[PDB]
Amino acid sequence: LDRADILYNIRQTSRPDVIPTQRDRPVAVSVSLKFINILEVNEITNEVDVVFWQQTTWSDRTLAWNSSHSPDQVSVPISSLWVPDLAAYNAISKPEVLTPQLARVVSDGEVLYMPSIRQRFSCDVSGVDTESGATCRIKIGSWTHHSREISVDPTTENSDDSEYFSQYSRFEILDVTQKKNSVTYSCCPEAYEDVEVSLNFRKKG
Amino acid sequence: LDRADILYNIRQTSRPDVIPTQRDRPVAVSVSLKFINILEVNEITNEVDVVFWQQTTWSDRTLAWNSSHSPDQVSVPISSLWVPDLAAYNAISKPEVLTPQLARVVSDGEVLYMPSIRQRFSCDVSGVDTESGATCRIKIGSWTHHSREISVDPDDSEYFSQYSRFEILDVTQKKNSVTYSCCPEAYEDVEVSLNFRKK
């Protein structure tokens, strides 16, 4: 297969508006937010403007191909693929995507989408000027799908406060924490999952 | 049926520019605001900047399918569906939709759409610094359809940001029917009253 053939098969097989559930079982999405910069802070409105890389991955095994004498991955415009309907529940601006809107499809059916996103969140911004600092919380989940359709888990990492965070930023990162939540209601057997990322940061002195 | 089949049938059946009236009777739209944040207030200009989830629901029975041996719901892009032409009559900015534009369709034809919206309003504003607070009214209704075509009907702090400068004292949601001398039909809205103050 060449790259064009692979992209042709991906388009035939991936239906951008249909979750690629294979039988019963949910699409397992892993997500991790990698903070690049904290840009603008507003004392008056308690808004913080944050740039982050949203590392997202999942599998669609029907996209898989034999790679032994073919390319092992391709880059694909996201409009040609299903991508999860992830949203930051508590954002107060629309996410501005800063990078080319392409995902990576690996020959085993793994899909990797890592947009750089600029987005505003609500933050305690008096504390940014204190030793303890401010904390910005970002809650990410599927906007419309429950756990039997899409499961959302924090990626397993080996990393840092950063190699990602701009060393030229006015702020420094004290701590990042990542937890999962699973919300269940007595009506229904399914769960609604999110990942909560906490960014504890302050001004450098 | 699988999910792909359901989405195929929904596309064939849903006409996004045609109100799904069933016989003469209006599409019953229900709407409710959940406030997430109040960002900027101006006592001088009477402008308020607000983030809210607009819980919207209605029925389109023609979308329905048999759900034994099939999924009972699916998520569908709103560009594949008719959605009500709701507007805040007293907005002074275009609504910034923050979330993915997908709705939930239930196998009985019920549709659930809940965008997170950021929008500025012209609003009273006075007494934001006082114990009693200020009250901002938001009026939401169909921009072009009257009551024979669309009818519009209706915890507090559960999703309200902990980092907000303000706190919510009370939210109330009441219905209005406006009638004009030309026409026997009425224009329906929900008036949402947000009583809030500075902490």
Binding site: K179, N181, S182, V183, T184, Y185, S186, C187 | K34
Partner: peptide, 30 residues
């Protein structure tokens, strides 16, 4: 066990929530 409305919660360290259509719920960690 933590009780949210009529609901008993699967697990520890939960937290109560209400959804406008689905009712009382448990937000559980991990």
């Amino acid at each position: 066990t933590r009780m949210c409305g009529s609901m008993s919660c699967p697990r520890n360290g939960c937290t109560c929530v209400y959804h406008w259509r689905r009712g009382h719920g448990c937000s559980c960690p991990g």
